[PDB]
Ligand binder design. Structure first.
Ligand SMILES: *[C@@H]1O[C@H](CO)[C@@H](O[C@@H]2O[C@H](CO)[C@@H](O[C@@H]3O[C@H](CO)[C@@H](O)[C@H](O)[C@@H]3O)[C@H](O)[C@H]2NC(C)=O)[C@H](O)[C@H]1NC(C)=O
Ligand SMILES: *[C@@H]1O[C@H](CO)[C@@H](O[C@@H]2O[C@H](CO)[C@@H](O[C@@H]3O[C@H](CO)[C@@H](O)[C@H](O)[C@@H]3O)[C@H](O)[C@H]2NC(C)=O)[C@H](O)[C@H]1NC(C)=O
Lengths: 438, 49
């Protein structure tokens, strides 16, 4: 039997779906989204880490000159200085007074622990959504894992479920992401091959295991001081370390809608928004024949106490008449009130009680027990407690019924004003028609 | 706590003496037997229990 429903996407919400086959007993289903997962699709841009400056020992040619040679190294630097007179611990070599040459060589290479400590740059698009939902009815429990799109059907005791696409398509990740260890950022990194010294991505490699590298650190060499062999250089500090020191904020501590961010793989967890459509196919054995179920006649509803609090804060009493004792599938036909239970035990005494939760001053809804139906209305008083540690269990609808106290007063005032206005209309029409009849 | 609906009050006898001199009857309809905390919302009458 085909059926369709929509449920809110909030973890822990006790959604109840009511299926009414005319030839059988009504059935009620309890669904609860235990877990969610927002998985974006990622493609690597590059890897970044600290650098290491490699400075080979200077080459001094005594009594001669040497000519600088170029090589293919990342940020390579080569220079020659003339007029050097080196010194050592025992005495100065290069016996010639002033015909000596020092050759300085330097270049930048990826650090040793880049494979253990590095940041990655990513692009994100077309996020997919995965879910884990617990379903209960009759005498079957159980949780299942599904992919939320119209292409995944899971069987649970002979029943086919399909959870259709999400209503919205909102994901906290922008186009470009910076991932570091266990934290995600909404950053705009510069593209490959155009880094800037002193900031993020001064050195960049395509992958962790690729040999190639692009570095840009403004390495400059200086003339050595007289009587020393020390090849002095200057270089802007590593951009990676200053990014660590001043990255600023995060996404773990700023994602909207209250949802966690995790890594490996990057995902957003328990992130409540929108609606999940559900399509259902139930076998003939799931229902119960109308002859087996007890019959209910003369069903009346009353409210003992109401209080629009977060928990289940109203108690309702149903009076009826039955032929035999058994089980009924109670339901509420409005989202103004959410029941606690889906099944009830009817006994020949004829009284049952239920608990419900709502958030309106004047609720009004139709409750059904087995095959019967009745109307319930109530007045509710505010709760006194200011803050609670459990989430609200109502659908958060506030507008009162038209028969509530405030709307009744408004309706009476409007009726009085309208009657007075219509009386004045009649006076004017009568006078003018007397004028015209003459 | 039990639910209480259809509460009606009747007074059998009254006598404004110093001792507890009025007997009152309440009729209701309840789902299960239990305990309630009775009170009077005015100081004209003082309950016993
Ligand atoms: C041992 O030490 C002597 C100096 O005490 C070294 O002699 C020096 O040799 C170099 C090249 O062998 C000379 O450089 C060039 O010499 C030519 C000579 O025509 C000159 O035209 C160039 O402008 C340049 O100076 C250097 O002058 C010379 N020093 C002198 C003559 O005082 C010698 O090389 C050392 N031994 C070895 C094996 O190198
Ligand atoms: C359908 O299955 C779920 C999962 O087993 C049932 O929920 C489980 O209910 C039991 C009984 O209440 C829980 O055991 C108790 O949990 C409390 C929680 O603090 C603990 O203090 C006790 O020591 C005891 O272990 C169990 O934790 C709970 N599990 C989950 C994941 O919710 C559920 O009741 C089943 N449905 C029906 C109708 O029985």
């Amino acid at each position: 039997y085909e059926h369709s429903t929509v449920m809110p996407n909030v973890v822990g919400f006790p959604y109840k779906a009511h299926i009414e086959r005319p030839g059988y007993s009504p059935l009620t289903l309890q669904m609860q989204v235990v877990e969610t997962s927002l998985e974006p699709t990622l493609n690597l841009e590059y890897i970044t880490c600290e650098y290491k400056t490699v400075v080979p020992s200077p080459y001094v040619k005594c009594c001669g000159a040497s000519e600088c040679s170029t090589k293919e190294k990342p940020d390579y630097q080569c220079k020659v200085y003339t007029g050097v007179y080196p010194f050592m611990w025992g005495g100065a070599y290069c016996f010639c007074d002033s015909e000596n040459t020092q050759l300085s060589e330097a270049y930048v290479d990826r650090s040793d622990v880049c494979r253990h400590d590095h940041a990655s740059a990513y692009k994100a698009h077309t996020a997919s959504l995965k879910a884990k939902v617990r379903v209960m009815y009759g005498n079957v429990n159980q949780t299942v894992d599904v992919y939320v799109n119209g292409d995944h059907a899971v069987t649970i005791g002979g029943t086919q479920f399909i959870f259709g696409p999400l209503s919205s398509a909102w994901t906290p990740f922008d186009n470009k992401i910076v991932v570091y260890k266990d934290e995600v950022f909404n950053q705009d990194f510069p593209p490959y091959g155009s880094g800037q010294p002193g900031r993020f991505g001064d050195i960049q490699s395509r992958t962790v295991e690729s040999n190639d590298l692009y570095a840009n650190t403004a390495l400059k060499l200086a003339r050595p001081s007289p009587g020393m062999v020390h090849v002095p250089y200057t270089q802007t500090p590593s951009g990676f370390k200053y990014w660590l020191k001043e990255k600023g904020t995060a996404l773990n501590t700023k994602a909207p809608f209250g949802c966690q961010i995790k890594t490996n793989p990057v995902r957003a967890m328990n992130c409540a928004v929108g609606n999940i459509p559900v399509s259902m196919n139930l076998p003939d054995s799931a229902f119960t024949r109308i002859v087996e179920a007890p019959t209910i006649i003369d069903l009346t509803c009353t409210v003992a106490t109401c209080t629009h609090s977060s928990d289940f804060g109203g108690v309702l009493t149903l009076t009826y008449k039955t032929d035999k004792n058994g089980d009924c599938s109670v339901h509420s036909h409005s989202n103004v009130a959410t029941l606690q239970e889906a099944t009830a035990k009817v006994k020949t005494a004829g009284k049952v009680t239920l608990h419900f939760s709502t958030a309106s001053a004047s609720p009004s809804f139709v409750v059904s027990l087995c095959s019967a139906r009745a109307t319930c209305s109530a007045s509710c008083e505010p709760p006194k407690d200011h803050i609670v540690p459990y989430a609200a269990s109502h659908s958060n609808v506030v507008f009162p019924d038209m028969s509530g106290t405030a709307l009744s007063w408004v309706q009476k005032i409007s009726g009085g004003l309208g009657a007075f206005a219509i009386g004045a209309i009649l006076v004017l029409v009568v006078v003018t028609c007397i004028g015209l009849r003459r």
